[PDB]
């Protein structure tokens, strides 16, 4: 049985995306410091410890699973869309993610608050007229109070509806004080919709909506995601291992369960 | 960097249109607001009205039947047109940003234009 | 909408410490009226000082400092110098629509 590793995970043959300071879902949505990911691809992600958001305070319900999906993927190609929102204001941002000289947000989401004096019942609708999947994310949020949500979004409690023609998420806002994180005690709550070829995405929503600025390319599951600390050293091995690269030579392995390659079966 | 320019006339006659440009840069005029402010001659600060980031536009009360502000978000252009020209409209032109924190809820007028000096008269 | 009323002009001298103050014919100014405070320097060039009342914009030294000082608002320059004398305008907000003050001329003695 092979029972050892290295203890390093060989740059080659594999792409090998070493995260750095960055999970996926924060290299994902945007997060300043990952904004070294964009369009980025690979074979095998890996994520270290380190690892630390540093943008608003969210949430992802189904977090291991759209985690997975897009890690599968392998590429992380974004691709801006046309969307037209008449009656708000775009660009929100805030100080829990600063960007250049002040106040910011993930780069991949569009913040949209009231303008002026109201907040319209947004209606948008796009096609998907291509060859290929739309992996649109999407997000709504939760003032912790009457007062933030009114200032934000006029409308007492908001709702965000994310249809496609075979869908249809309704999630409505939930004030409420949540524990304080950057210095806030709000929360926004990262959501998901695949569009498939010759649908249509609708977003109709009359408040709290943290609207898509595009969508994400998706190919086909060949990659793969892992975590470990493991130092990646310039060599070729096929068998990458959390622990390590360990050699494809024997048929059992019993290092790890968790795999990357042409690998001995585990015991 | 912030930075806002008006362009206009500089002399229109009583009864005629005045049309005022604000060139916005360094922002978008989705992401902000953008204000408009007159200070006549050896006179106080006058509010004309506004054009937020969603088109809308709020102006003020007075003034209301004959300004009007618009904008072409493509080009970074904010349009201040006035008709019913008359003498009294003489003042300094002024655009100014508007701004509003997310973490605090405030309004506020950070960016002000250099200004426009427009003299009405025959 | 309102009328928002102020010094016509104050003057200080190098080191005092001058209040310039911000009434409204409505009644007393609330946070709701997120105060601002311009302030107009030579050949009208203006330049934001104060935002919703004591935020103090970036460039403005430490010494202006924004306040509700009783049903007023009020701007406190502490050790006013030559460099501050100016036009201070007052705008406060209601309900969509600014209203700006008379504007207070300040002299520094020198």
């Known amino acids: 049985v092979q029972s050892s590793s290295t203890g390093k995970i060989c740059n080659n043959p594999h792409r090998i995306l070493d995260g750095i300071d960055c999970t996926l879902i924060d290299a994902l949505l945007g997060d300043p410091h990952c904004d070294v990911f964009q369009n980025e691809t690979w074979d095998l992600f890996v994520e270290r410890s380190k690892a630390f958001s540093n943008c608003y305070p969210y949430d992802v319900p189904d977090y291991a699973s759209l985690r997975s999906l897009v890690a599968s993927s392998g590429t992380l190609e974004f691709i801006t869309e046309g969307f037209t929102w008449t009656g708000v204001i775009q660009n929100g941002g805030s100080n829990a993610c600063k960007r250049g000289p002040g106040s910011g947000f993930f780069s991949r989401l569009n913040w949209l608050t009231k303008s002026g004096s109201t907040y319209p019942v947004l209606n948008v609708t796009m096609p998907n007229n291509d060859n290929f999947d739309k992996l649109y994310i999407w997000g709504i949020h939760h003032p912790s109070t009457n007062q933030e949500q009114t200032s934000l979004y006029v409308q007492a409690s908001g709702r965000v509806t994310v249809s496609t023609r075979r869908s249809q998420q309704t999630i409505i806002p939930n004030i409420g004080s949540r524990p304080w994180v950057r210095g806030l005690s709000s929360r926004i709550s990262i959501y998901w919709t695949i569009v498939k070829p010759g649908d249509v995405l609708v977003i109709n929503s009359n408040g709290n909506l943290i609207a898509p600025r595009g969508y994400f390319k998706m190919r086909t599951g060949k990659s793969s995601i892992m975590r470990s600390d493991a130092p990646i050293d310039t060599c070729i091995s096929e068998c990458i291992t959390p622990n390590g690269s360990i050699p494809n030579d024997k048929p059992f392995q019993n290092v790890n369960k968790i795999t990357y390659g042409a690998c001995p079966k585990y015991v | 960097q912030v930075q806002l320019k008006e362009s206009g006339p500089g002399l229109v006659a009583p009864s005629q249109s005045l049309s005022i440009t604000c060139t916005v840069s360094?922002?978008?005029?989705?992401?902000?607001?953008v204000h408009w402010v007159r200070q006549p001659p050896g006179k106080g600060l006058e509010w004309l009205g506004v054009?937020?980031?969603?088109?809308?536009?709020n102006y003020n009360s007075a003034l209301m039947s004959r300004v009007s502000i618009s904008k072409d978000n493509s080009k970074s252009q904010v349009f201040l047109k006035m008709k019913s020209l008359q003498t009294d409209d003489t003042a300094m032109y002024y655009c100014?940003?508007?701004?509003?924190?997310?973490?605090?809820?405030?309004?506020?007028?950070?960016?002000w234009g250099q200004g426009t000096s427009v003299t009405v008269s025959s | 909408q309102a009328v928002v009323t102020q010094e016509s002009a104050l003057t200080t001298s190098p080191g005092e410490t001058v209040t310039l103050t911000c009434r409204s014919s409505t009644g007393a100014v609330t946070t709701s009226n997120y105060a601002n405070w311009v302030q107009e320097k030579p050949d009208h060039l203006f330049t934001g000082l104060i935002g919703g009342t004591n935020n103090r914009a970036p460039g403005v030294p430490a010494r202006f400092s924004g306040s509700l000082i009783g049903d007023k608002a009020a701007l406190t320059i502490t050790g006013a110098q030559t460099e501050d004398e100016a036009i201070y305008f007052c705008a406060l907000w209601y309900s969509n629509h600014w209203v700006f003050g008379g504007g207070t001329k300040l002299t520094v003695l020198g």
């Open positions: 054009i937020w980031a969603g088109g809308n536009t």
């Open positions: 100014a940003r508007d701004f509003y924190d997310y973490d605090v809820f405030y309004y506020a007028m950070d960016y």
């Open positions: 360094g922002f978008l005029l989705i992401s902000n607001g």
